[PDB]
Design an enzyme around this catalytic site. Structure first.
Site, PDB file in Angstrom:
ATOM      1  N   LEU A  70     -11.664  -4.621   4.327  1.00 28.05           N
ATOM      2  CA  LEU A  70     -12.706  -4.989   5.196  1.00 28.05           C
ATOM      3  C   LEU A  70     -11.978  -5.432   6.581  1.00 28.05           C
ATOM      4  O   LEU A  70     -12.497  -6.001   7.300  1.00 28.05           O
ATOM      5  CB  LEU A  70     -13.704  -5.966   4.658  1.00 28.05           C
ATOM      6  CG  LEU A  70     -14.468  -5.782   3.333  1.00 28.05           C
ATOM      7  CD1 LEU A  70     -15.495  -6.810   3.211  1.00 28.05           C
ATOM      8  CD2 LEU A  70     -14.874  -4.289   3.263  1.00 28.05           C
TER       9      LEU A  70
ATOM     10  N   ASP B  17      -6.196  -6.300  -0.957  1.00 26.93           N
ATOM     11  CA  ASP B  17      -7.392  -5.652  -0.856  1.00 26.93           C
ATOM     12  C   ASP B  17      -7.653  -6.092   0.842  1.00 26.93           C
ATOM     13  O   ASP B  17      -8.672  -6.939   1.229  1.00 26.93           O
ATOM     14  CB  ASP B  17      -8.444  -6.652  -1.545  1.00 26.93           C
ATOM     15  CG  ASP B  17      -9.900  -5.965  -1.815  1.00 26.93           C
ATOM     16  OD1 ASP B  17      -9.664  -4.568  -1.508  1.00 26.93           O
ATOM     17  OD2 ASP B  17     -10.661  -6.154  -2.134  1.00 26.93           O
TER      18      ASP B  17
ATOM     19  N   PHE C  22       0.856  -1.190   0.074  1.00 29.54           N
ATOM     20  CA  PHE C  22       0.012  -0.017  -0.004  1.00 29.54           C
ATOM     21  C   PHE C  22       0.781   1.321  -0.159  1.00 29.54           C
ATOM     22  O   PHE C  22       1.612   1.517   1.049  1.00 29.54           O
ATOM     23  CB  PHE C  22      -0.932  -0.109   1.232  1.00 29.54           C
ATOM     24  CG  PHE C  22      -1.731   0.814   1.399  1.00 29.54           C
ATOM     25  CD1 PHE C  22      -1.503   2.469   1.900  1.00 29.54           C
ATOM     26  CD2 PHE C  22      -3.211   0.922   1.080  1.00 29.54           C
ATOM     27  CE1 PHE C  22      -2.637   3.594   1.943  1.00 29.54           C
ATOM     28  CE2 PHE C  22      -4.132   1.864   1.182  1.00 29.54           C
ATOM     29  CZ  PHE C  22      -3.877   3.111   1.768  1.00 29.54           C
TER      30      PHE C  22
ATOM     31  N   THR D 280      -1.540   1.030  -4.874  1.00 26.20           N
ATOM     32  CA  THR D 280      -1.042  -0.307  -4.341  1.00 26.20           C
ATOM     33  C   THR D 280       0.054  -0.682  -5.380  1.00 26.20           C
ATOM     34  O   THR D 280       0.260  -0.287  -6.487  1.00 26.20           O
ATOM     35  CB  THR D 280      -2.214  -1.207  -4.179  1.00 26.20           C
ATOM     36  OG1 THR D 280      -2.617  -1.808  -5.345  1.00 26.20           O
ATOM     37  CG2 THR D 280      -3.078  -0.640  -3.229  1.00 26.20           C
TER      38      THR D 280
ATOM     39  N   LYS E 262     -10.045 -14.697   0.502  1.00 23.73           N
ATOM     40  CA  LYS E 262     -10.555 -15.441  -0.620  1.00 23.73           C
ATOM     41  C   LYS E 262      -9.510 -15.526  -1.650  1.00 23.73           C
ATOM     42  O   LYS E 262      -8.789 -14.567  -1.743  1.00 23.73           O
ATOM     43  CB  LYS E 262     -11.814 -14.917  -0.861  1.00 23.73           C
ATOM     44  CG  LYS E 262     -11.834 -13.678  -1.437  1.00 23.73           C
ATOM     45  CD  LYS E 262     -13.614 -13.335  -1.442  1.00 23.73           C
ATOM     46  CE  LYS E 262     -13.771 -11.895  -2.058  1.00 23.73           C
ATOM     47  NZ  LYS E 262     -15.046 -11.685  -2.537  1.00 23.73           N
TER      48      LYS E 262
HETATM   49  C1  LIG Z   1      -1.920  -3.276   2.812  1.00 23.25           C
HETATM   50  N1  LIG Z   1      -2.121  -3.640   1.271  1.00 23.25           N
HETATM   51  C2  LIG Z   1      -3.055  -3.411   0.893  1.00 23.25           C
HETATM   52  N2  LIG Z   1      -4.158  -2.652   1.189  1.00 23.25           N
HETATM   53  C3  LIG Z   1      -5.448  -2.528   0.359  1.00 23.25           C
HETATM   54  C4  LIG Z   1      -6.544  -1.804   0.705  1.00 23.25           C
HETATM   55  C5  LIG Z   1      -6.652  -1.065   1.883  1.00 23.25           C
HETATM   56  C6  LIG Z   1      -7.913  -0.282   2.429  1.00 23.25           C
HETATM   57  C7  LIG Z   1      -8.868  -0.243   1.267  1.00 23.25           C
HETATM   58  C8  LIG Z   1      -8.772  -1.163  -0.028  1.00 23.25           C
HETATM   59  C9  LIG Z   1      -7.571  -1.715  -0.241  1.00 23.25           C
HETATM   60  C10 LIG Z   1     -10.155  -0.904  -0.755  1.00 23.25           C
HETATM   61  C11 LIG Z   1     -11.069  -0.370   0.312  1.00 23.25           C
HETATM   62  N3  LIG Z   1     -10.110   0.287   1.154  1.00 23.25           N
HETATM   63  C12 LIG Z   1     -10.446   1.313   1.872  1.00 23.25           C
HETATM   64  O1  LIG Z   1     -11.477   1.769   2.034  1.00 23.25           O
HETATM   65  C13 LIG Z   1      -9.442   1.995   3.068  1.00 23.25           C
HETATM   66  C14 LIG Z   1      -8.699   3.029   2.456  1.00 23.25           C
HETATM   67  C15 LIG Z   1      -7.619   3.484   3.179  1.00 23.25           C
HETATM   68  C16 LIG Z   1      -7.714   3.264   4.738  1.00 23.25           C
HETATM   69  C17 LIG Z   1      -8.660   2.376   5.196  1.00 23.25           C
HETATM   70  C18 LIG Z   1      -9.466   1.833   4.426  1.00 23.25           C
HETATM   71  O2  LIG Z   1     -10.689   0.882   5.022  1.00 23.25           O
HETATM   72  C19 LIG Z   1     -10.695   0.747   6.175  1.00 23.25           C
HETATM   73  C20 LIG Z   1      -9.580  -0.153   6.750  1.00 23.25           C
HETATM   74  C21 LIG Z   1      -9.441  -0.105   8.264  1.00 23.25           C
HETATM   75  C22 LIG Z   1      -8.647  -0.742   9.047  1.00 23.25           C
HETATM   76  C23 LIG Z   1      -7.752  -1.738   8.160  1.00 23.25           C
HETATM   77 CL1  LIG Z   1      -6.585  -2.705   9.076  1.00 23.25          CL
HETATM   78  C24 LIG Z   1      -8.012  -1.688   6.902  1.00 23.25           C
HETATM   79  C25 LIG Z   1      -8.647  -0.855   6.213  1.00 23.25           C
HETATM   80  C26 LIG Z   1      -5.082  -3.188  -0.624  1.00 23.25           C
HETATM   81  S1  LIG Z   1      -3.276  -3.664  -0.657  1.00 23.25           S
HETATM   82  N1  LIG Z   2      -3.463  -4.425  -7.197  1.00 20.94           N
HETATM   83  C1  LIG Z   2      -3.820  -4.733  -8.138  1.00 20.94           C
HETATM   84  N2  LIG Z   2      -3.199  -5.157  -9.156  1.00 20.94           N
HETATM   85  C2  LIG Z   2      -3.703  -5.855 -10.298  1.00 20.94           C
HETATM   86  N3  LIG Z   2      -4.923  -5.964 -10.626  1.00 20.94           N
HETATM   87  C3  LIG Z   2      -5.657  -5.537  -9.397  1.00 20.94           C
HETATM   88  C4  LIG Z   2      -5.340  -5.066  -8.336  1.00 20.94           C
HETATM   89  N4  LIG Z   2      -6.496  -4.887  -7.329  1.00 20.94           N
HETATM   90  C5  LIG Z   2      -7.427  -5.323  -8.166  1.00 20.94           C
HETATM   91  N5  LIG Z   2      -7.021  -5.681  -9.634  1.00 20.94           N
HETATM   92  C6  LIG Z   2      -7.959  -6.262 -10.295  1.00 20.94           C
HETATM   93  O1  LIG Z   2      -9.265  -6.000 -10.109  1.00 20.94           O
HETATM   94  C7  LIG Z   2     -10.124  -7.090 -10.129  1.00 20.94           C
HETATM   95  C8  LIG Z   2     -10.369  -7.609  -8.553  1.00 20.94           C
HETATM   96  O2  LIG Z   2     -11.692  -6.987  -8.252  1.00 20.94           O
HETATM   97  P1  LIG Z   2     -11.895  -6.127  -6.844  1.00 20.94           P
HETATM   98  O3  LIG Z   2     -11.106  -4.844  -7.489  1.00 20.94           O
HETATM   99  O4  LIG Z   2     -11.624  -6.596  -5.588  1.00 20.94           O
HETATM  100  O5  LIG Z   2     -13.420  -5.313  -7.132  1.00 20.94           O
HETATM  101  P2  LIG Z   2     -14.722  -6.103  -6.421  1.00 20.94           P
HETATM  102  O6  LIG Z   2     -15.434  -7.059  -7.366  1.00 20.94           O
HETATM  103  O7  LIG Z   2     -15.621  -4.983  -6.092  1.00 20.94           O
HETATM  104  N6  LIG Z   2     -14.241  -6.854  -4.988  1.00 20.94           N
HETATM  105  P3  LIG Z   2     -14.673  -8.670  -4.956  1.00 20.94           P
HETATM  106  O8  LIG Z   2     -16.085  -8.983  -5.509  1.00 20.94           O
HETATM  107  O9  LIG Z   2     -14.687  -8.736  -3.233  1.00 20.94           O
HETATM  108  O10 LIG Z   2     -13.472  -9.158  -5.445  1.00 20.94           O
HETATM  109  C9  LIG Z   2      -9.298  -8.465 -10.700  1.00 20.94           C
HETATM  110  O11 LIG Z   2      -9.560  -8.529 -12.185  1.00 20.94           O
HETATM  111  C10 LIG Z   2      -7.676  -7.828 -10.684  1.00 20.94           C
HETATM  112  O12 LIG Z   2      -7.088  -8.209 -11.706  1.00 20.94           O
HETATM  113 MN   LIG Z   3     -11.086  -7.815  -4.052  1.00 16.89          MN
END
Ligand SMILES: CNc1nc(-c2ccc3c(c2)CCN3C(=O)c2ccccc2OCc2ccc(Cl)cc2)cs1
Ligand SMILES: Nc1ncnc2c1ncn2[C@@H]1O[C@H](COP(=O)(O)OP(=O)(O)NP(=O)(O)O)[C@@H](O)[C@H]1O
Ligand SMILES: [Mn+2]
Ligand SMILES: [Ca+2]
Length: 262
Positions: free
Chosen positions: A159, A156, A74, A89, A139
């Site tokens: 949640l 991701d 992130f 990310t 998942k």
């Molecule tokens: C670590 N590496 C990676 N992180 C992600 C990742 C992280 C956050 C989010 C997404 C993907 C998509 C939705 N999202 C946010 O809305 C959201 C955004 C910013 C801050 C909090 C958020 O959410 C609440 C929350 C509260 C506590 C914890 Cl511990 C985490 C998140 C992808 S790769």
């Molecule tokens: N960091 C990433 N790098 C590359 N592709 C990503 C990345 N994050 C998401 N994707 C692409 O986005 C898709 C994943 O779906 P997502 O972004 O989780 O939407 P969503 O359907 O709303 N969540 P979910 O239904 O729980 O999987 C895949 O086709 C991945 O290839």
């Molecule tokens: Mn997802």
């Protein structure tokens, strides 16, 4: 050529949609500091309570400190106006694991063993933070393959969560206090889906049917189709009804199956 930019100028956005979700769109972008391609995710606008945006602002500071090889990196997050919240990310080059499973039927056990060990190492990182992080949505769609060696990373974390007493509390309140063991349960379902290339509880039609099932002792139909008994036994000890009877992640990584390097 860039269509969007971060305020600091580090991150660029290209108008090439690489992923799509119902409340999030993923575009290809660039980290100009490191010249690596990154994932640029636009999330649907959300309510702006003053206390919530100070919480998001500080939760994102923690997330960009989580550097581990089996967790998707992130980089940053800020608010913008394409019409929303922007997330940057690490770019996963080979798609999600669900994409791999959707293409083939029988994963080989060297790959089952290697990919699950990395998932566990990534979960173990999250659970040893201060305070611990509970993913809550493990998942195969949230597990990514990337790079030349085919490295497996967990992504991701949208949640996830961190970490008187009522007298007349309903049973749902009493069982509501759960811990990292919900990620062990989810890991067992992912390993089941990897070893069967079938969705667990496919036969069901809703989540209501799903709960009443685990509770009486009916595991997914795919569980009784697992070929390797060692894998099957790891799966059942992961998806046990009572959390206190389940594997911990550390005992999983101490298992003979994962102690092998093949
Ligand atoms: C670590 N590496 C990676 N992180 C992600 C990742 C992280 C956050 C989010 C997404 C993907 C998509 C939705 N999202 C946010 O809305 C959201 C955004 C910013 C801050 C909090 C958020 O959410 C609440 C929350 C509260 C506590 C914890 Cl511990 C985490 C998140 C992808 S790769
Ligand atoms: N960091 C990433 N790098 C590359 N592709 C990503 C990345 N994050 C998401 N994707 C692409 O986005 C898709 C994943 O779906 P997502 O972004 O989780 O939407 P969503 O359907 O709303 N969540 P979910 O239904 O729980 O999987 C895949 O086709 C991945 O290839
Ligand atoms: Mn997802
Ligand atoms: Ca169905």
């Amino acid at each position: 050529k860039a269509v969007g930019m971060s305020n600091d100028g580090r991150f660029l956005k290209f108008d090439i949609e690489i992923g799509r979700g119902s409340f999030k769109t993923v575009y290809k972008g660039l980290d100009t500091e490191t010249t690596v391609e990154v994932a640029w995710c636009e999330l649907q606008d959300r309510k702006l309570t003053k206390s919530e945006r100070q919480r998001f602002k500080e939760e994102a500071e923690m997330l960009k400190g989580l550097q581990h090889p089996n967790i998707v990196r992130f980089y940053d997050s800020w608010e913008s106006t394409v019409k929303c919240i922007v997330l940057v990310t690490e770019l996963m080059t080979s798609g999600t694991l669900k994409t791999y499973l959707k293409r083939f039927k029988v994963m080989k056990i060297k790959v089952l063993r290697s990919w699950c060990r990395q998932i566990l190492k990534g979960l173990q990182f999250l659970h040893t933070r201060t305070p611990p992080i509970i993913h809550r949505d493990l998942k195969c769609d949230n597990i990514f393959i990337t790079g030349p060696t085919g490295s497996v990373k967990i992504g991701d974390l949208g949640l996830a969560t961190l970490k008187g007493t009522p007298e007349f509390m309903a049973p749902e309140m009493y069982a509501a206090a759960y811990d990292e063991s919900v990620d062990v349960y989810a890991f067992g379902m992912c390993m089941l889906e990897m070893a069967t290339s079938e969705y667990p509880y496919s036969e069901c039609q809703n989540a209501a049917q799903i709960y009443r099932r685990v509770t009486s002792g009916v595991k997914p139909a795919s569980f009784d189709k697992v070929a390797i008994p060692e894998v099957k036994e790891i799966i059942e000890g992961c998806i046990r009804q009572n959390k206190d009877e389940r594997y911990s992640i550390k005992d999983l990584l101490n298992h003979a199956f994962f102690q092998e390097e093949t």
